[PDB]
RNA sequence: AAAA
């Protein structure tokens, strides 16, 4: 009997999916090689140990063993391996190794909304397929997610702007969602069922919550699909309409939801996400190096990393039509930086043998003519990345972010030049323009003692002498809203001097206007952090929810944010996995930190960004 | 991490 050999991260549903796939082609199988990645938090495990259980319902025998374990030679006949898990690096090291006789190699691709993953067969012969069949079902999903995460549920009719054959459930413990299964791809759909529930305003807070929501329950992929209020729109005046809707468009774009006419199928919103970006021609050839090759998706990070380590004099960036905005935003970026860009769309995020024709002949030219050529295997589904390095030649430099250090291909790592990052470049990439409320502001000893002269008598009505100062060193003046001012000053005074020395680069607040208003900004090492500034805990708990969306969508997977008060009263802060509470003064053995003195402390308490593959 |  067949073995399945299967990198396994955090998401057990490619790992289930590709056992399935092998089942069907080749029976039972004899057991099950798990190359297993830690779980980045506590419900994964769970679902991990839900896949595991599952495992065991199925009689089927495995095991977990080091990436390293893996680099082998097999004890079976026959080996099925499964590539999609974890992090693309890894795949990229297995197809190395497992493209050899007795080793089918393949990944399982469910990364385009409304169709069924498919399978990539890439070894011993290149063949795809759809998997409607081996599909997960509702209540496969439900076993692998909502079992786990303690979440009841039952089965409803499932909406009509779904194709056919869509199953669904409604968790009676989480108000205001649907979840759904259609064609073994996850969906948290956005149902107001209650009287005039579609005639009122959508909030930003909402919005929001409900993204994160969908990713807690179905991952990585889960779709929020939020059929806008259409009813609250035609009580409105004509002007305010379009105003109303407009704010609900930035809203899921800076959140990630997949906001819907709700007069509309499902198949059609997406079909015109996609439509009309069909790419005709080749990639023009490579004149002048050094060279970046690079897939453009969600995290902006290990593409900004490979822009500050290969100093490229042109790019070249492929993604899907879905991702047309981040493409457009990457390179509005590299031509701001002089880099010549060349972009050209795949037909969908399956499309490994399209990446690889395009970019072949791209290293070739640049080989032949000397141009350091680097690639940048972080970004793309696995499908695209691996694609990529299958354009690769001998001579090409392949590396892979791997929190704050490139990892190379065939072995050592590159330290990145993060003292020539900006928070601002960062920002850019990602689609947004940061407009700064105080430019010109740099860390004063007299102007801070002031700030902070304020900071211990904030009972109030000097205040005066303050702005006047602030005028003199900077020359910025206000008209007769600056309350919150004296607090900035000091987080981004203390955080510069920390930050500085060690190459990290720290800002006052401003505005992050989509090509939301914050208090400061600060990159260190390939982690992106906003701050936010309060007089009490009491402020800092009213932004938190907002703020961890905040920070994970437009940051990224390993951002953070900084939330930072004069004075910290009430209880320990609420649970949260990307932001860090200090205070001026209180919360001392609630879990806060004390600013400055605990700066250290609290910045690398849970380090940022992550390594996951040391 | 199923598009670090």
């Given at each position: 009997a067949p073995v399945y050999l299967c990198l396994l991260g955090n998401d057990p549903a490619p790992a289930y999916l590709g056992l399935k796939v092998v089942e069907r082609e080749a029976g039972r199988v004899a057991k099950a090689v798990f190359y297993s990645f830690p779980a980045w938090n506590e419900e994964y495990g769970k679902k991990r140990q839900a896949f595991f259980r599952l495992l065991s319902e199925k009689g089927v025998l495995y095991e977990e063993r080091p990436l390293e374990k893996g680099l082998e030679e097999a004890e079976a006949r026959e080996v099925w391996v499964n590539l999609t898990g974890g992090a693309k690096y890894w795949a990229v090291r297995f197809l190395g190794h497992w493209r050899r006789p007795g080793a089918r190699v393949f990944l399982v691709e469910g990364h385009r909304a409304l169709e069924a993953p498919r399978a990539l067969f890439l070894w011993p012969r290149e063949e795809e397929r759809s998997l409607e069949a081996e599909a997960l079902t509702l209540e496969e999903y439900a076993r692998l997610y909502l079992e786990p995460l303690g979440e009841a549920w039952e089965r409803v009719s499932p909406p009509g702007?779904?194709?056919?054959?869509?199953?669904?459930?409604?968790?009676?413990?989480?108000?205001g969602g649907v979840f759904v299964v259609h064609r073994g791809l996850p969906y948290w759909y956005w149902v107001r069922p209650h009287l005039g529930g579609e005639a009122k305003d959508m909030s930003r807070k909402a919005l929001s919550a409900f993204s994160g929501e969908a990713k807690r329950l179905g991952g990585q992929l889960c779709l929020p699909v939020v059929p806008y209020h259409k009813a609250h729109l035609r009580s409105r005046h004509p002007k305010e309409r379009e105003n109303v809707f407009a704010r609900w468009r930035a809203w899921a774009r800076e959140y990630g939801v997949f906001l819907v006419d709700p007069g509309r199928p499902l198949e059609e919103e997406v079909a015109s996400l996609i439509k009309g970006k069909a790419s005709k021609k080749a990639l023009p050839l490579p004149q002048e190096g050094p060279l970046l090759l690079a897939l453009v998706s969600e995290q902006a990070v290990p593409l900004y990393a490979a822009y500050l380590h290969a100093g490229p004099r042109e790019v070249y960036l492929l993604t899907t039509p879905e991702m047309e905005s981040r493409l457009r935003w990457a390179e509005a970026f590299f031509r701001g930086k002089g880099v010549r860009v060349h972009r050209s769309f795949l037909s969908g995020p399956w499309a490994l043998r399209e990446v690889r024709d395009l970019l072949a002949p791209?290293?070739?030219?640049?080989?032949?003519?000397?141009?350091?050529?680097?690639?940048?295997?972080?970004?793309?589904?696995?499908?695209?990345?691996?694609?990529?390095?299958?354009?690769?030649?001998?001579?090409?430099?392949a590396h892979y972010l791997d929190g704050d250090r490139l990892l190379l291909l065939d072995g050592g790592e590159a330290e990145v030049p993060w003292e020539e990052g900006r928070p601002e470049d960062l920002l850019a990439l990602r689609g947004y323009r940061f407009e700064e409320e105080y430019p010109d502001a740099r860390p004063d000893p007299g102007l801070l003692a002031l700030a902070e002269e304020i900071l211990r008598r904030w009972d109030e009505v000097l205040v005066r002498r303050f702005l006047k100062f602030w005028k003199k060193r900077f020359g910025q003046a206000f008209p007769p809203r600056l309350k919150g001012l004296p607090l900035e000053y000091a987080v981004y005074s203390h955080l510069n001097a920390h930050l500085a020395p060690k190459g990290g680069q720290a800002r006052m607040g401003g505005h992050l206007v989509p090509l939301t208003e914050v208090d400061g900004v600060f990159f260190?090492?390939?982690?992106?952090?906003?701050?936010?500034?309060?007089?009490?805990?009491?402020?800092?708990?009213?932004?938190?929810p907002i703020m961890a969306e905040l920070v994970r969508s437009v940051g990224g997977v390993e951002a953070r944010g900084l939330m930072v008060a004069r004075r910290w009263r009430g209880a320990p802060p609420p649970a949260s996995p990307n932001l860090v509470y200090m205070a001026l003064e209180g919360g001392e053995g609630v879990g806060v930190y004390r600013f400055p003195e605990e700066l250290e402390k609290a910045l690398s308490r849970n380090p940022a960004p992550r390594r996951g593959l040391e």
């Open positions: 702007a779904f194709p056919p054959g869509a199953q669904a459930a409604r968790l009676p413990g989480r108000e791209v290293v070739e030219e640049a080989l032949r003519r000397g141009h350091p050529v680097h690639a940048n295997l972080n970004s793309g589904t696995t499908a695209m990345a691996l694609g990529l390095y299958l354009a690769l030649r001998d001579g090409a430099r260190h090492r390939g982690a992106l952090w906003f701050v936010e500034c309060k007089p009490t805990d009491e402020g800092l708990r009213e932004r938190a």
